[PDB]
Amino acid sequence: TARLLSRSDWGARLPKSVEHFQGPAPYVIIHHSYMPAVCYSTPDCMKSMRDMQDFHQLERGWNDIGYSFGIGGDGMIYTGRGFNVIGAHAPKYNDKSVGIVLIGDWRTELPPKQMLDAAKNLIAFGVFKGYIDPAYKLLGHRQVRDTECPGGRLFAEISSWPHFTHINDTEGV
């Protein structure tokens, strides 16, 4: 039942500028938003995408909302910067990943199933269309930066996902 909604679908303001990266993304980075909290109705979710984009563009002076895609409590996927566009959600990975933010604070509570499935479907489609490398590596934001994101509970959940990985599984500069 999960649909991919376009930027226009949620009333997104235009990017101030769009940078690109080539090839299929070798990484998928999972985030939670922390604030806003989980949204359950599509209209609340569309406003949460708007609130994050306002905060990003207007208050942080970024070109657009920092993530590639957002996932709402309504089970819908929301287009952010989209595939193959450099993001602003994970330093050193912005030009080689798909940053997916599950809307809400997931440090302790587990995201409802429709959200988990939506993120899986989004990734599957990414690989199906060639936007995500078939040997992609799945990570949580905390593994590449000093942050608690995507929350302890959501992080334990993604560690059970196919392709999940730990950077230090590999030794060597």
Q: How far is the CB of 125 from Zn ion (least distance, A)?
A: 22
Q: Known binder of ligand: residue 163?
A: no
Q: How far is the CB of 113 from Zn ion (least distance, A)?
A: 21
Separation between Cα atoms, residue 151 and residue 156, nearest integer Å: 9
Reported residue count of the chain is 173
Q: How far is the CB of 54 from Zn ion (least distance, A)?
A: 18
**CB closer to Zn ion out of 75 and 140:** 140
Sheet of 25-32: strands edge to edge? 4-5, 77-79, 69-71, 97-102, 25-32, 132-140
Phi-psi map region of 23: left, alpha, beta (phi>0 left; psi -120 to 50 alpha):
left
Q: How far is the CB of 142 from Zn ion (least distance, A)?
A: 8
Q: Known binder of ligand: residue 31?
A: yes
| Nearest one of 101, 113, 111, 81 to 32, comparing CA atoms | 101
**In the window 5-34, what residues touch Zn ion (CB under 5 A)?**
31
**CB closer to Zn ion out of 4 and 88:** 88
Q: How far is the CB of 128 from Zn ion (least distance, A)?
A: 25
* 26 in Cβ contact with 137 (< 8 Å): yes
| Nearest one of 140, 142, 134 to 25, comparing CA atoms | 134
Phi, psi dihedrals of residue 20, rounded to the nearest 5°: -120, 160
Q: Known binder of ligand: residue 141?
A: yes
> Does the protein bind Zn ion through residue 149 (CB under 5 A)?
yes
What DSSP line would sit under 9-47, residue for residue?
GGTPPPPS---B--SSEEEEEEEE-SSSPP--SHHHHHH
**CB closer to Zn ion out of 34 and 40:** 34
**CB closer to Zn ion out of 39 and 149:** 149
> Does the protein bind Zn ion through residue 65 (CB under 5 A)?
no
> Does the protein bind Zn ion through residue 56 (CB under 5 A)?
no
> Does the protein bind Zn ion through residue 141 (CB under 5 A)?
yes
Binding residues for Zn(2+): 31, 141, 149
User: Rule CB under 5 A: which residues touch Zn ion?
Assistant: 31, 141, 149
Please state the residue numbers annotated as binding site.
31, 141, 149
